[PDB]
Scaffold this active site. Sequence first.
Site, mmCIF file in Angstrom:
data_model
loop_
_atom_site.group_PDB
_atom_site.id
_atom_site.type_symbol
_atom_site.label_atom_id
_atom_site.label_comp_id
_atom_site.label_asym_id
_atom_site.label_seq_id
_atom_site.Cartn_x
_atom_site.Cartn_y
_atom_site.Cartn_z
ATOM 1 N N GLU A 35 0.860 -1.192 0.000
ATOM 2 C CA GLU A 35 0.000 0.000 0.000
ATOM 3 C C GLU A 35 0.895 1.241 0.000
ATOM 4 O O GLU A 35 0.574 2.156 -0.753
ATOM 5 C CB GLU A 35 -0.967 -0.053 1.178
ATOM 6 C CG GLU A 35 -1.992 -1.181 1.057
ATOM 7 C CD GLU A 35 -3.097 -0.976 0.036
ATOM 8 O OE1 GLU A 35 -3.037 0.012 -0.666
ATOM 9 O OE2 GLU A 35 -3.988 -1.806 -0.063
ATOM 10 N N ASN A 46 -7.621 8.187 -5.952
ATOM 11 C CA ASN A 46 -8.472 7.196 -6.665
ATOM 12 C C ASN A 46 -9.206 7.860 -7.856
ATOM 13 O O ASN A 46 -9.574 9.066 -7.793
ATOM 14 C CB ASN A 46 -9.450 6.573 -5.653
ATOM 15 C CG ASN A 46 -8.745 5.930 -4.477
ATOM 16 O OD1 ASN A 46 -9.150 6.063 -3.327
ATOM 17 N ND2 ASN A 46 -7.662 5.231 -4.764
ATOM 18 N N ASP A 48 -12.337 7.706 -8.468
ATOM 19 C CA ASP A 48 -13.653 8.274 -8.053
ATOM 20 C C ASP A 48 -13.476 9.677 -7.421
ATOM 21 O O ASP A 48 -14.519 10.257 -7.078
ATOM 22 C CB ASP A 48 -14.414 7.292 -7.154
ATOM 23 C CG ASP A 48 -13.819 7.107 -5.768
ATOM 24 O OD1 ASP A 48 -12.758 7.692 -5.472
ATOM 25 O OD2 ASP A 48 -14.444 6.430 -4.974
ATOM 26 N N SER A 50 -11.841 10.270 -4.502
ATOM 27 C CA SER A 50 -11.451 9.921 -3.121
ATOM 28 C C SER A 50 -9.915 9.862 -3.121
ATOM 29 O O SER A 50 -9.292 9.774 -4.239
ATOM 30 C CB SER A 50 -12.122 8.619 -2.658
ATOM 31 O OG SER A 50 -11.628 7.481 -3.373
ATOM 32 N N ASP A 52 -6.576 7.932 -0.814
ATOM 33 C CA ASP A 52 -6.046 6.962 0.172
ATOM 34 C C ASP A 52 -4.888 7.603 0.935
ATOM 35 O O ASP A 52 -4.003 8.197 0.290
ATOM 36 C CB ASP A 52 -5.570 5.704 -0.534
ATOM 37 C CG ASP A 52 -6.683 4.834 -1.083
ATOM 38 O OD1 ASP A 52 -7.873 5.119 -0.836
ATOM 39 O OD2 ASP A 52 -6.335 3.863 -1.764
ATOM 40 N N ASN A 59 -9.130 5.068 2.869
ATOM 41 C CA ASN A 59 -9.858 5.720 1.759
ATOM 42 C C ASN A 59 -10.802 6.765 2.362
ATOM 43 O O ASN A 59 -11.515 6.431 3.354
ATOM 44 C CB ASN A 59 -10.621 4.690 0.913
ATOM 45 C CG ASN A 59 -11.070 5.271 -0.407
ATOM 46 O OD1 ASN A 59 -10.932 6.467 -0.627
ATOM 47 N ND2 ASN A 59 -11.527 4.437 -1.328
ATOM 48 N N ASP A 101 -15.463 -4.844 9.068
ATOM 49 C CA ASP A 101 -16.659 -4.386 8.297
ATOM 50 C C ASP A 101 -17.341 -5.524 7.513
ATOM 51 O O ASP A 101 -18.423 -5.263 7.005
ATOM 52 C CB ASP A 101 -16.342 -3.246 7.320
ATOM 53 C CG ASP A 101 -17.511 -2.303 7.061
ATOM 54 O OD1 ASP A 101 -18.230 -1.966 8.042
ATOM 55 O OD2 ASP A 101 -17.706 -1.908 5.881
#
Length: 129
Positions: A35, A46, A48, A50, A52, A59, A101
Site C-alpha cells: 500500500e 483514486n 472516483d 477519493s 487513500d 480511503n 466491516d
Amino acid sequence: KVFGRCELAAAMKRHGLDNYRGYSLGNWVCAAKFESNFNTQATNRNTDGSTDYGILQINSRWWCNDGRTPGSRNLCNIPCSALLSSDITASVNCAKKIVSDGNGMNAWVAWRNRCKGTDVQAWIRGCRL
Ligand code: NA
C-alpha cells in the site's frame, strides 16, 4: 516516516494488530509494504476522486474526512491528515474498524492481489517480536 520492516511489525504488535480479526502480523506488514512501502506520508488519488492516506492507504470515501470527497463518510471520525502521522495509532484504530466491516482484509485490494494466500510470515522473519 519510512518505517523499517521489523520496526513497523513491532509498532503494529504494540497497538494489537497481530492476529486482529484473525490476521497474523505478517498479513498487516505485507499490506503496509504494497500500500505505502512503509511510508506514513503516502497519499494516492483514486479514479472516483477519493484519496487513500497513510501506511495502510485508508480511503476518504468511507473512513476519514479530507473535505473534498463529495458524498463520502468519515466512519473513523478523524481528519485524513491524522493518518499521515509518524505515530500509527490513528491508522491502526481505523484499520481495526475497516477489517471488522464484513470482508476482512479483502478491503485492501493490494492485500487481496499481493499478500492473500502467500508466505506472509516471511514479512516478520528475523524480527525480535
Ligand atoms: Na470522507
